[PDB]
Symmetry: C2
Subunit: 446 residues, 2 copies
């Protein structure tokens, strides 16, 4: 009954009004995700995605973000989902231990443009796709990520499917069906972190979410109970029989997970496991009046489960650097900031950068439970002329405890779109903000 109940909750909510705060949360998620995408459109991964579109000989009217080109909705969702994750700057969501918006927002744009949808419905579909992935993440728990799966795509695909299906006009049956199709297209592994395959996870999840929904509307069948039982995808991913499943569903919309705990907005284009350490380092530098020239070493601690994604101690590519605490803290020490340019290959290969990276060491922080990059707390030690400065960082930057405010999000957008021609970034920012006023999503044209 879990799958049936979830589709009832989603479709019933779809037919009802949704709160101003939820729509505002969704609006901000859109702006952050498009910023993240536009900051990454020159990456090789996205350029190759564009080449793929050329190779398909395909055509259509869904906008490929950052370029004056359109294609069919499936391939647009692929390209834009790739772009949304290309520099690891898009949001996280601790309930899922992953990045839901880099599949969901691309899917919503691709389908929304196709069907001529307006902003309230688009935003509502985001709210509901996030509620679905929150419910599934709660069901699955911590084991799925620890076992080597990337929940970003393995669970993200269901978010994308949900919003696509709703926009396409799915009823409960069609929605249940679409989730069944998606479950057989649920994939992505952690060993591909530090490669271009990581943004493919979200490209594929967006495309597959759109495709799964569209197929469902064509009377193409899949399992309508795919979340249920030992044979269902949740159990396969480690959901335990008992109350976990019942606990998960009890949340629904009271409050919406897009509000609480909400989407965590990244201050730096790198793995969240870097971010409490960076916050702490910068706070120490500011408070004590230290530059990196005044710091001889930094020790960065990690709770159980947190270090997993940071695969590279000596990263050699732009992608690897985002999964290196050495590169993150190294750049912070060298430049006094971490920016879009920090992980560009020319910056990464500076002799001075490689020197700074050698100032950084990792250590284990003891605990009886496991945590993630967006949860728990971090201990750092900053070594200086006058001794060691110890600090515990309790708030994750971007969480409700250290939220990104309007001014911060606007500056992120600006920085990610600095390459756009005169005036075009501001105009796009304004159009993005008009979704709240029920403007046609096709008018936005990121």
């Amino acid at each position: 009954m879990f799958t049936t109940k979830l589709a009832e909750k989603v479709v019933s909510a779809w037919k009802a009004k949704i709160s101003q705060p939820a729509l505002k949360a969704a609006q901000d998620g859109v702006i952050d995700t498009v910023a993240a995408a536009l900051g990454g459109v020159t990456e090789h991964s996205v350029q190759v995605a564009l080449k793929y579109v050329a190779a398909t000989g395909g055509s259509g009217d869904s906008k490929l973000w950052g370029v004056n080109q359109r294609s069919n909705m499936f391939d647009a969702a692929f390209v834009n989902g790739m772009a949304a994750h290309a520099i690891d700057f898009d949001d996280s969501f601790p309930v899922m231990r992953g990045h839901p918006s880099s599949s969901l927002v691309p899917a919503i744009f691709a389908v929304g443009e196709h069907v001529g949808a307006n902003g309230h419905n688009c935003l509502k579909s985001y709210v509901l796709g996030i509620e679905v992935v929150a419910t599934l993440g709660r069901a699955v728990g911590k084991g799925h990520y620890l076992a080597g799966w990337h929940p970003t795509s393995t669970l993200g695909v269901f978010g994308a499917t949900t919003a696509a299906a709703l926009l396409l006009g799915a009823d409960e049956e069609q929605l249940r069906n679409a989730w069944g199709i998606a479950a057989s297209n649920s994939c992505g592994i952690i060993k591909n972190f530090g490669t271009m395959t990581k943004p493919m996870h979200t490209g594929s999840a967006a495309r597959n979410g759109v495709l799964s929904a569209w197929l469902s509307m064509q009377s193409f069948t899949g399992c309508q109970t795919v979340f249920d039982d030992a044979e269902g995808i949740l159990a396969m991913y480690g959901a335990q029989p008992g109350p976990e499943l019942f606990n998960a569903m009890q949340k629904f919309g009271t409050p919406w997970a897009i509000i609480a705990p909400g989407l965590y907005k990244k201050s730096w284009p790198s793995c969240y496991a870097n971010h409490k350490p960076l916050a702490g380092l910068f706070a120490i530098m500011k408070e004590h009046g230290l530059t990196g020239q005044d710091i001889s070493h930094v020790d960065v601690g990690f709770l159980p489960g947190v270090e997993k994604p940071l695969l590279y101690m000596d990263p050699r590519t732009t992608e690897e650097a985002k999964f290196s605490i050495e590169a993150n803290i190294g750049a912070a020490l060298l430049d006094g900031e971490v920016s879009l340019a920090s992980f560009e290959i020319e910056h990464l290969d500076r002799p001075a950068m490689r020197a700074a990276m050698k100032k950084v060491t990792r250590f284990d922080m003891p605990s009886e439970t496991t945590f993630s990059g967006t949860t728990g707390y971090t201990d750092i030690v900053v070594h200086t002329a006058d001794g060691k400065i110890e600090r515990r960082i309790e708030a994750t930057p971007g969480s409700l405890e250290d939220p990104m405010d309007d001014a911060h999000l606007e500056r992120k957008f600006k920085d990610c779109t600095a390459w756009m021609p005169f005036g075009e970034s501001g105009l796009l920012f304004d159009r993005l903000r008009s979704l709240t006023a029920d403007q046609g999503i096709k008018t936005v044209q990121p």
Copy 2:
């Protein structure tokens, strides 16, 4: 380590000649797979796949089987993969516990047509794709299927990737890269059996295999050690990482797995778990001179692990019936045969068919280990007016112990293509066989 050693073996074999029996085995595989596809091109799943192609606006020179249409190689692989598996009449491969040819052969035609490949290289790519999937199958063991995944696609994607890569000109590095990409596109679950999503598994695997290969040739990166260690996909699927992995590839090409145990060709369009039961029933009917009217009941036994895919005792769709021993034995009883028309919805819905299905029941056969529909043995009991006939069926139809010979494979092709315009089936049969003569694959045009 395992991944690098496997790519070395594949590329070394690629550059060498392969034996005639390997070539023949590949040739027969192509013919069986195209037969199976051409028998299923009218299924709603394929019809929807063709609607998808129309929706993409895609174009190219990869032919779509059974229709006068061509598209790009990715979408042709998708459509023809869907078609190859649409009525469950394609081959099985015990070492993988799945259907490798329904992703491999579509990928080979799509890529081969694109690059103007000749028959010997096409057939060689098939042999090597099969050798890779045999290797991975041996490494993962029995647990993966039993845990709810469909090895047909989860492992089959690597077959398709290997062949596509080789045809596109991959070296070792690019092959290793392609596997990495493909590993994040490994998916498909058993709970979708009896729905249109099952043949999507093979369409998706074929397309993803072609895409992973293509992407690798564009310097799009994935993990180059993706089958190694606990973090690799084989361990994730239950293999024992470390040195023990190399036992999986100790006799690579000696003999080729495409020869021993070989591809198992189906005599009936349904799950293999139905097939020893049917062979037994027909033998008893023939030996004892019994028609279905002479038989009041049939008991069908299943060793541990074997019954798993037969999800439906009361199938209500064409797809469900293929996963129902009741439907299979029912149709055998009523008509004295099982054919392509047996599982069409009008035949399934016959009151006399529904009555015959009620004569069938299932039972467990004891063992300390688990088996599959292409291994072990089957006990059946046929009930007649005089008493009960028990029979143990030791050989799986299509295995080396009960192989499909040339005359039978040609008959299967004929039956699957009888709808074609007058003379075209034979013309196509001859063109398919021209691959053995190193003709250009582009001439074949299924």
